[PDB]
Ligand binder design. Structure first.
Ligand SMILES: COc1ccc2[nH]c(C(=O)NS(C)(=O)=O)cc2c1
Ligand SMILES: COc1ccc2[nH]c(C(=O)NS(C)(=O)=O)cc2c1
Lengths: 287, 279
């Protein structure tokens, strides 16, 4: 064990440091809560923290790591916002006791060797054009789950496909951890929190509202069925200035089929200039 | 003498004079007279008007029942059982002759809004509605009168009636009562076969979707509504219009009202909803 000063933010770099300290708190009967982030924290992140925080006797581990494996190449990796400064101050403000900030060398000392192969879900939606994206995410998440060994792990529903693949990872490998999805934190107009938002000029920031509006429209249109919930989304996206829709898709909650159903999930991906915005909502199909 | 009035029971008057003497006698005893005008065939929409009128401290409730033959289907004993079961104390149920003893002589001519929307098919309908509501107001002299939001063009015309003629009555508009799938209640609903009944869901769906799309602005809202109407078979949309809440031209942002009207077979349906543009 290295130092753990309780009630204070404790920052570890080494997997073995966070692992030892984690394992120690797990005996003293505290409950290890893990919030995996790529940093550049926003209110969405803090909701995850706060939800972690509200677990009786929780000790909250925020991991901060920009996983080069879920990226390209790609274009993604050198772009991704990096502000450990703010990130760590926000965590201190929130009363988070551990930040785990590993080096790429310490996570990947053997490069990409043993990895997680996701199911067929991972080739769809966001995995369509990014076929190794989810393998990266799941490999890093498994490794964090192994290093920290939490009781519970907290993700947003912003990345809803990731959250399902994570529930799969956890079921398929018999991981002893509860996955907590946390409803998406939204701007005042409805724009889903994202680090990727900073890269929207005013004009785009204003057109961006169209995603949350289309989806909230379809969830109310849905009493009249799937076609009308879809047509209602599409109509709003259409009415909106330089939103180019990648996809708009209605699925079941586990991102399978989508029956004549009630409960489903509506997912949109769109570009505003160069900025790719994702969003999704619970939909109950009415007729 | 004042007509017999038994507190706590449903006292029915057909005579305009009788109900006038009762309400004026009641106003002086410290009751606040609330009017709920209806055309009978009472549904949950009416009982919600009633419940709103009931909850005013010291309210006495007058529910008029009167089929206007001047504005554009009888169940007298059941209607009265529903009122009794709401704890209404007055039902006013005039004949045509009692209300129009001289036929149609003096009438209310509405302003130009009576000519729009629902006044397109029926050009004289709101003349008839304003004439009987003005007369109901002078007979009963209520402190407050309660109308559903269902017929929103009508409610706006009533508020204009009241302002224009310096009527000293509060107009209260009560949010539309809907079925479980959101179909605005109406007595026409029971005429729809299962196919039409199912397609009819699309008026409310349209309007709710519009109201949520509205954060993306006025055009998104309309396009949302229309997309949902376009997904329904056998729904012939007579209009779909967004207006300010007084039914003038929709202003660039801020509060508004989305209205629709449609034919499903022989049955003409309407609905409307609050809109906040940029919300
Ligand atoms: C609770 O609501 C929200 C809203 C937006 C969110 N974005 C992210 C995120 O980017 N996570 S990561 C692991 O850094 O890629 C989480 C999240 C949660
Ligand atoms: C409170 O919600 C509602 C919903 C539907 C309604 N319809 C009527 C109605 O038909 N009134 S009438 C024929 O002019 O007497 C009132 C009403 C109220």
């Amino acid at each position: 064990i290295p130092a753990f000063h309780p009630g204070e933010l404790n920052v570890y770099s080494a997997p073995g440091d966070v692992a030892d300290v984690s394992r120690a708190l797990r005996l003293t009967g505290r409950r290890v809560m893990l919030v995996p982030t790529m940093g550049a924290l926003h209110e969405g992140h803090l909701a995850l923290v706060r939800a972690a925080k509200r677990v009786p006797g929780s000790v909250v581990v925020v991991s901060i790591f920009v996983n080069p494996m879920q990226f390209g190449a790609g274009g993604d990796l050198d772009a991704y916002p990096r502000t450990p400064d703010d990130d760590l101050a926000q965590l201190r403000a929130e009363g988070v006791e551990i930040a785990f900030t590993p080096t790429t060398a310490a996570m990947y000392p053997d490069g990409l060797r043993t990895t997680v192969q996701p199911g067929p879900l991972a080739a769809e939606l966001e995995g369509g054009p990014r076929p190794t994206h989810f393998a990266g995410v799941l490999t890093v998440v498994l490794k964090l789950l192994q290093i920290v060994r939490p009781d519970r792990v907290f993700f947003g529903e912003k990345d809803y496909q990731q959250l399902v693949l994570i529930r799969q990872l956890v079921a398929d490998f018999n991981l002893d951890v509860a996955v907590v999805g946390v409803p998406t934190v939204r701007e005042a107009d409805g724009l889903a929190m994202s680090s990727r938002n900073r890269y929207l000029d005013p004009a785009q920031r204003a057109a961006a509202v169209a995603l949350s509006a289309a989806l909230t429209a379809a969830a109310h249109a849905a009493t009249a069925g799937a076609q009308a919930a879809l047509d209602a989304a599409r109509a709003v996206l259409d009415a909106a200035p330089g939103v180019a829709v990648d996809y708009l898709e209605l699925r079941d909650i586990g991102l399978g089929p989508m029956p004549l159903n009630g409960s489903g999930r509506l997912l949109v991906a769109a570009r505003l200039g160069t900025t790719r915005l994702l969003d999704n909502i619970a939909i109950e199909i009415g007729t």
